[PDB]
């Protein structure tokens, strides 16, 4: 009972997540690595009260993010080194309360309302629904876009590699972020052209990324709203981390728009995370699924529920593969859907 | 690489403790033990959306508070069982967001502001400082008092048993809550009289506990302000979980009020969690210490800091006894201070 009780207190504790997040937000690990080892030197770098900073560091040592090397000198463990801003998993940014995702997590403080009503909680804190908030704040939009694309150059290699492109001439990436998926497809399949459809602000950052990668002649970027008719037909339409943002009714409206723009013999590729229901009681499914509830009113769906959504949009799930992230301990799902 | 990343993401996660706290708030484990094992029966008992509730339950399973046995039927594990309302540790009530402490913990969402300023963040969220907020909400005043005295009949036995009451005729328990400590001393040392000094609301609940226990004529309760001169003198003056509510300058003011109210040969007893600084880098010390920062601008003090604080009030630390805790695994100490 002693071990059970401390297991519960730990899982229940709010100060630990918040200590990690403030350390990230304060750039503590970066500052230690640049030579500020002592509490007083870190206090000066972060403009904090030395005694308050010492109390925060005390907890960071307790939970294994920092350790003492010499008297009053602290140093990141291997876990703490992950908060270095140049680390490829970009966990410092992802835990930064000033950036879009960690800021969105304050939504979890009203979790009971979400479970009670099934509605997102984000608006009640920040005054606008998620995407209107990002649109009314271009600096948060930019942050959000860079977080989801922190991984861009490798995150889409695997799903692109899992799909055969022989029967594809044009690709439409609906809600395609900074153009990473489209880029990965282009590099792997020289005969394919692509169009990325996105919202304002994001479109310019997608163009600029594609120009940097030397793919502007092969990948086009267009501003648009994916609830309206899509501007182009395609042999392959990608919905990567889109459908999970939306409740069922809207997710079907999106799938239906995609189905309607499908060229004969076409397919849509859903890239996000699913599970068979019996295998869904795990931390990777729930962590993202609950973010979707509270940020947006969206959801991860089970393999079984995907049969239902697919059918309501005039589609069938042809096959589901699961694929590992190259950056982070997380599996993704690639679902290929065919017209009925 | 893989394991460091997953360790970091777990530690950084806000959704887990909020999931625990809303399960506690919804009385989920109680409803299960009373016969409601399905999401359907639980959603009806808790007035939540079935589909949203299933998603909460899915995470309660992944982190190991619940498991399925029969198809669609859930039961608490060894760890989930601790959220039963009548469990001795009372962890359900301590994680209930309608009760004072878990409500107060939302203050951790602004931990960066607390590290910068050394000041509480509670008022920035709820509109008044901690004790002024309780003073205007009898709802929270009462739940706070019951949380702190959830252990009332045993928590003060050890420290009461640990002090020598032979030369003590009167005891002043400054900020004594419901009067538990005073009662345990009365029982153990029948020759003693005691006075509990407390705030409005708490004074009624202290008299009512002492009357039910039959000790009205041996322990009287006084409404008062321990920053003002204390209403009486005494041979032992108790500060049990008081000084930690206050920054150095206020704690010295209180210690000095106590020193002025001492009779010749009298001692003041501080009942509180402490630690040698070199041993303070542990989860027991930081969890309570950061709560005091963020709720109240208070602090746990180390053994070394206690010497400085006592000296500022014209006192020395004459001895410290270590105390085993008979409810939750959480070491405490009884410090005995005399005039220097
Ligand atoms: C720690 C796990 C994860 O990183 C997983 C996933 O991120 C995946 C896919 C990203 N991508 C391409 C969008 C990126 O490759 C990242 C490294 O892994 C992901 C993730 O994909 C998203 C979020 C995450 O937190 C995460 C992270 C998570 O679940 O932490 C609890 C969002 O918060 C989020 C918020 C609002 C809208 C969103 O949809 C576009 C997302 C979102 O897609
Ligand atoms: C989980 C461990 C603990 O409960 C330990 C401690 O409580 C101790 C002493 C209590 N007592 C004698 C008054 C009681 O017996 C409790 C069961 O254990 C304690 C604790 O003592 C307090 C708090 C805790 O969370 C805890 C707990 C904790 O560290 O959670 C992270 C407060 O939040 C708190 C808030 C505002 C004012 C406060 O003081 C008047 C407290 C406080 O004293
Ligand atoms: N009505 C709408 N029309 C077009 N895009 C929308 C939209 N609502 C949201 N989106 C977009 O869809 C995206 C989801 S997130 C980025 C997903 C990206 N394909 C990736 O996997 O990394 C956002 O970039 C956002 O701009
Ligand atoms: N100005 C003041 N005057 C008298 N009591 C105060 C006070 N400000 C706060 N307090 C109190 O001191 C108590 C701290 S809680 C500790 C209660 C008890 N000694 C125990 O060990 O459980 C609270 O109950 C609160 O009412």
Q: Which of A64, A87, A84 is nearest to A74 (CA)?
A: A64
Q: Is the dihedral of CA B1, B2, B3, B7 positive or negative?
A: positive
Smallest CA–CA separation between A36 and chain B, in Å?
A: 17
**Spatial distance between the Cα atoms of B262 and B247, rounded to a whole number of angstroms:** 23
Q: Which residues form ligand 3's pocket by a CB distance below 6 Å?
A: A 131, 148-149, 175-177, 181, 198-199, 202, 224-227, 240-242
> For chain B, first and last CA: distance in Å?
55
Chain region(s) in chain A for CATH 1.10.287.1350: 98-148+274-297
Annotate A196-210 with b (16+ C-beta within 10 A) or e (fewer): bbbbebbbebbbebb
**Spatial distance between the Cα atoms of B196 and B174, rounded to a whole number of angstroms:** 6
Asked if B267 contacts B217 with a C-beta cutoff of 8 angstroms, the reply is: no
Pairing outcome for strands B332-339 and B262-272? antiparallel
Joined together, the tokens standing for residue B289 give 């210490």
**Spatial distance between the Cα atoms of B210 and B259, rounded to a whole number of angstroms:** 27
**Spatial distance between the Cα atoms of A317 and A339, rounded to a whole number of angstroms:** 9
Nearest to B106 among A52, A109, A283 (CB): A109
Exposed/middle/buried for residue B50 (C-beta within 10 Å: 0-12, 13-18, 19+): middle
A106 touches chain B (CB under 8 A): yes
User: Which among A4, A7, A12 is the top mutation candidate for probing chain B, defined by the most B β-carbons within 10 Å of its own β-carbon?
Assistant: A12
CB of B298 shorter than 6 A to ligand 4: no
Q: Which residue has the tokens 């723009």?
A: A261
CA distances from B174 to B159, B225, B315 (A): 16, 9, 17
Which CATH architecture fits A149-273+298-340?
Answer: 3-Layer(aba) Sandwich (3.40)
Asked if A320 contacts A334 with a C-beta cutoff of 8 angstroms, the reply is: yes
Joined together, the tokens standing for residue B20 give 């625990």
B327 touches chain A (CB under 8 A): no
**Spatial distance between the Cα atoms of B271 and B173, rounded to a whole number of angstroms:** 11
Nearest to A17 among B4, B13, B115 (CB): B13
Pairing outcome for strands B234-240 and B262-272? parallel
Residues 6+ away with beta carbon under 8 Å from B298:
B243, B244, B245, B246, B247, B292
Quote the ligand 2 centre to A340 CA distance (angstroms).
61
CB of B147 shorter than 6 A to ligand 4: no
Quick check: helix, strand or coil at residue A262? Answer: strand
Chain region(s) in chain B for CATH 1.10.10.10: 1-97
**The domain over range A98-148+274-297 is classified in CATH as 1.10.287.1350:** yes
User: Which among A1, A17, A20, A328 is the top mutation candidate for probing chain B, defined by the most B β-carbons within 10 Å of its own β-carbon?
Assistant: A17
Q: Whose CA is nearest to atom 2 of ligand 4?
A: B225
- Tell me the residues of chain A between 216 and 245 that have a Cβ less than 8 Å away from chain B: none
Exposed/middle/buried for residue B163 (C-beta within 10 Å: 0-12, 13-18, 19+): buried
User: What was the elucidation method?
Assistant: X-ray
**Spatial distance between the Cα atoms of B158 and B148, rounded to a whole number of angstroms:** 16
Q: What is the DSSP letter of A201?
A: T
Chain region(s) in chain A for CATH 3.40.50.150: 149-273+298-340
**Spatial distance between the Cα atoms of B42 and B27, rounded to a whole number of angstroms:** 10
CB of B291 shorter than 6 A to ligand 2: yes
- Quick check: A4 and B108 CB within 8 A? no
Residues 6+ away with beta carbon under 8 Å from A242:
A174, A175, A226, A254, A272
Q: What is the 3-state secondary structure (H, E, C) of chain B?
A: CHHHHHHHHHHCCCHHHHHHHHHHHHCHHHHHHCCCCEHHHHHHHHCCCHHHHHHHHHHHHHCCCEEECCCCEEEECCCHHHHCCCCCCCHHHHCCCCCHHHHHHHHHHHHHHHHHHCCCCHHHHHCCCHHHHHHCCHHHHHHHHHHHCCCHHHHCHHHHHHCCCCCCCEEEEECCCCCHHHHHHHHHCCCCEEEEEECCCHHHHHHHHHHHCCCCCCEEEEECCCCCCCCCCEEEEEEECCHHHCCHHHHHHHHHHHHHCEEEEEEEEEEECCCCHHHCCCHHHHHHHHHHHHHHCCCCCCHHHHHHHHHHCCEEEEEEEEECCCCCCCCEEEEEEEEC
Residues flagged as binding site of B: 141, 151, 175, 198, 225-226, 240, 245, 291
Q: What is the CA radius of gyration of chain B?
A: 22
Asked if B121 contacts B128 with a C-beta cutoff of 8 angstroms, the reply is: no
Which CATH architecture fits B1-97?
Answer: Orthogonal Bundle (1.10)
């Amino acid at each position: 009972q002693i071990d059970a009780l401390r297991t519960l207190i730990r899982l229940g504790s709010l100060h630990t997540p918040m200590v990690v997040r403030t350390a990230a937000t304060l750039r503590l690990v970066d500052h230690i690595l640049a030579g500020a080892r002592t509490v007083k030197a870190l206090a000066a770098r972060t403009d904090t009260r030395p005694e308050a900073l010492l109390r925060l560091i005390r907890h960071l040592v307790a939970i294994g993010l920092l350790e003492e090397d010499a008297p009053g000198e602290f140093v990141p463990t291997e876990v703490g080194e992950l908060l270095a801003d140049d680390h490829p998993a970009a966990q410092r940014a992802w835990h930064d309360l000033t950036q879009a995702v960690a800021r969105a997590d304050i939504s979890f403080t009203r979790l009971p309302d979400a479970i009670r009503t099934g509605r997102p909680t984000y608006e009640s804190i920040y005054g606008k629904p998620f995407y209107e908030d990002l649109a009314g704040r271009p600096d948060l939009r930019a942050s959000f876009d860079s977080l989801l694309a922190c991984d861009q150059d490798v995150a889409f290699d695997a799903p692109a590699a899992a799909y055969d492109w022989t029967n594809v001439r044009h690709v439409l990436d609906v809600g395609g972020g900074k153009g990473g998926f489209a880029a990965a497809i282009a590099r792997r399949a020289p005969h394919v052209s692509a169009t990325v459809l996105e919202m304002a602000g994001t479109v310019d950052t997608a163009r600029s990324y594609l120009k940097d990668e030397g793919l502007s002649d092969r990948v086009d970027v267009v501003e648009g709203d994916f609830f309206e008719p899509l501007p182009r037909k395609a042999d392959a339409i990608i919905l990567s981390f889109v459908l999970l943002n939306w409740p069922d009714h809207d997710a079907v409206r999106i799938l239906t728009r995609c189905a309607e723009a499908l060229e004969p013999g076409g397919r849509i590729l859903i890239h996000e995370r699913d599970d068979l229901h019996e295998n869904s009681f795990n931390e990777q499914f729930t962590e993202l699924d609950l973010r979707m509830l509270v940020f947006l009113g969206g959801a991860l769906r089970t393999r079984e529920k995907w049969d239902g959504l697919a059918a309501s949009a005039g589609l069938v799930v042809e096959e589901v593969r699961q694929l590992p992230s190259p950056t982070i301990p997380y599996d993704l799902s690639l679902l290929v859907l065919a017209p009925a």
